[PDB]
Specification:
Keywords (chain A): Hydrolase, Metalloprotease, Protease, Signal, Zinc
InterPro entries (chain A): Metalloenz_LuxS/M16 (IPR011249), Pept_M16_N (IPR011765), Peptidase_M16 (IPR050626), Peptidase_M16_C (IPR007863)
GO cellular component, one term (chain A): outer membrane
Helix content of chain A: 40-55%
Organism (chain A): Pseudomonas aeruginosa (strain ATCC 15692 / DSM 22644 / CIP 104116 / JCM 14847 / LMG 12228 / 1C / PRS 101 / PAO1)
Strand order of the largest sheet of chain A: 1-2-6-3-5-4
Order of helices and strands of chain A: EEEHEEHHHHHEHEEHHEEHHHHHE
Oligomer: homodimer
CATH class of the largest domain in chain A: Alpha Beta
Radius of gyration of chain A: 22 Å
GO biological process, one term (chain A): proteolysis
């Protein structure tokens, strides 16, 4: 029940009908992000978004999205005002001067004065030496401090264009109905030449980077990241999917390895997690987080020793399909759960599409996960969990 | 004997008259460098320079074109430069081979020169938030995706007259030059530039430590501390003091590292210091050293050794006596260093490129001499901290 058409101006439109309730979701996804940004002018995408402002907006490394959820008959007015945004930017000098302070202020409160946020910003910069991924989305303070109205306008001109955008609609509508409105509201808007956009590729083996940061935190903790591919950047999708599965094996659940082995069973860590986004425009990071079992006086150095042991085990011993399946199934199940929810489907469509991946993937994703074999997993672990790919940071209390 | 004027297109001209010999230096400086480059599009400034072809250099902050000429030659050289400013002329075919050359040059010079490769990685860690993290040559992946259209745009953007400085030094006169600069350059119109932002780094990025395994066979150590430069600094004095600290540590055969560590303790095979105080943005004070492996030394001991020397500076300032000896020697090095007209004129071009007046050239020596011993201690304390440090261990494979 999903249709794809593109307007003359290069706007791509995706529509999925779901008549279960009389509501429709409209999201607009622009392919501009912090990874496109240039030093001394960081934070631009996020500011620009903030300035053109249920409905919400979000800016990440690879995209900026505006979405609204609404009553089916009100779709025409939702589309009209998203089109307005695309069409022109009304931003007064007076408005700007006030907003920039808010943003700067937001940087202090939520990044600088948030010790975990702070540490992560640093970790991320060290982890991504060559790619745009190193840049903080909020922007460096020095950059915000120097940002100007003209810089914002120009950014708007350059990137907020129909051929840089995807409109996604799901809900109680007809694809023809949507098609008609888009032309009506967006059709007018002309195509604009874009700046060059390059996937944010990173070195495969940057070397071993270790960070020590003292922050206003009460609990010492360890962050380990491994430079890796994503579907945006990978000629072998199998290895990526193998990586996703590895995270699930480590972090998802009571019986998952880190919990049973390190939290219980050894008492090395208080908690431990993993995060890996497989759906980047470019390359990605496989991340580990643990905090030490302070009660037993366990050091960060011990935690790290413990994590490597678990990573080694994967290299040495392919996990059983009995393990993989339990782990795979639950991943699918959780993913399926999101399926329902027109908003989630819309976001899945917009995310992937902003990143150079087709929406057609979602359907085949569950087949793809299925293809992973215990061998794939072992192979990916051997390949990627090398010290040459590691950024490790100790976040310590001062 | 030095005069500056600007043409109405905003090109700035500085002429310095020296008549000892009928030779003249002509240099053209553009304010564009690798520090300006966007991710995924690194290498552009360097690549462009490659295409313009007596000589040229691209760095973080600038691109310079320079010749040394007989005076009669000067009109022709100015013509060729004006031509380069005005009309790109960049055929596709030419791009295709040249990019290939540059890529190979990266493979060889940066990928099989183990130290160059290591320094590049070290630099990227040293500069989390500023443009200086980017290698001038460019990352290989950016190189592979570069297009002729990308180059033309860089040229349209940055190689404008109002972004350039023309420096002429030698047996010429300000008037003649003004006449020539008008003839060749005057018609090239002013263009609106993209925004330029100084490459300001974080003050305290945090302690970062690197381990790289490379194709060398001697292990070495690199220590970088994030610091200010004249481009970025409110207190110029602290910068000048850092310069002296550099002189003190590795200024000469008799300087502290050589005397104490190379000889002395015999900790190091060699030890060096680097600090560029004339950057658009912030900068790095750099130490590099090799272990005494005959004596079975390790990188860990070498580190402790360097750290000990840094601390002594902190703990108590150097005698006013050392300060002269080290200083005087530094200056003699500088005086030997002005002399040339080429150097004498690139000193101007570099300064104008990073946002600083040429009038500094004269002003410098006085400035070192005004650094007090207390200035040195305060600087060592302020700056030589683990929170400013990025440390690399460079090991053989």
């Amino acid at each position: 029940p999903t249709h794809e058409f593109s307007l003359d101006n290069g706007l791509k439109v995706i529509v999925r009908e779901d008549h279960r309730a009389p509501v429709v979701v409209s999201q607009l996804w622009y392919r501009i992000g912090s990874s496109y940004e240039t030093p001394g002018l960081t934070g631009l995408s996020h500011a620009l978004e903030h300035m053109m402002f249920e409905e919400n907006a979000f800016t990440t490394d690879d995209y900026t999205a505006y979405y609204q959820v609404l009553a089916r008959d009100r779709l025409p007015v939702a589309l009209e005002m998203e089109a307005d945004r695309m069409a022109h930017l009304s931003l007064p000098v007076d408005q700007f001067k006030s907003e920039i302070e808010v943003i700067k202020e937001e940087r202090r409160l939520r990044t600088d004065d948030n010790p975990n946020a702070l540490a992560f910003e640093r970790f991320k910069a060290a982890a991504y030496p060559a790619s745009g991924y190193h840049t903080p989305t909020i922007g460096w303070m020095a950059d915000l401090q120097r940002m100007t109205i003209d810089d914002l306008r120009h950014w708007y001109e350059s990137w907020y264009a129909p051929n840089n955008a995807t409109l996604v609609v799901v809900g109680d509508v007809t694809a023809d109905e949507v098609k008609t409105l888009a032309k009506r509201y967006f059709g007018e808007i002309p195509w604009r030449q874009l700046p060059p956009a390059r996937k944010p590729l990173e070195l495969a083996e940057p070397g071993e980077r270790r960070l020590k940061l003292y922050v206003r935190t009460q609990l010492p903790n360890l962050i380990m990241g491994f430079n890796v591919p994503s579907l945006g950047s990978s000629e072998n999708p199998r290895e990526v999917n193998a990586l996703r599965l590895i995270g699930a094996l480590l972090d998802g659940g009571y019986s998952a390895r880190l919990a049973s082995r390190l939290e219980r069973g050894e008492e090395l860590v208080a908690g431990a997690s993993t995060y890996y986004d497989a759906f980047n425009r470019g390359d990605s990071l496989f991340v580990l987080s643990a905090t030490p079992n302070v009660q037993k006086g366990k050091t960060l150095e011990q935690v790290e020793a413990g994590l490597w042991k678990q990573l080694d085990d994967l290299k040495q011993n392919p996990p059983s399909a009995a393990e993989i399946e339990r782990v795979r199934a639950q991943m699918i199940a959780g993913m399926v759960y999101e399926k329902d929810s027109i908003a989630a489907q819309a976001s899945s469509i917009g995310q992937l599409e902003s990143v150079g991946l087709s929406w057609k993937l979602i359907d085949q994703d569950l087949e793809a996960l299925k293809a992973v074999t215990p061998d794939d997993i072992q192979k990916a672990a051997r390949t990627y969990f090398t010290p040459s790919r590691l950024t490790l940071a100790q976040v310590l209390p001062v």
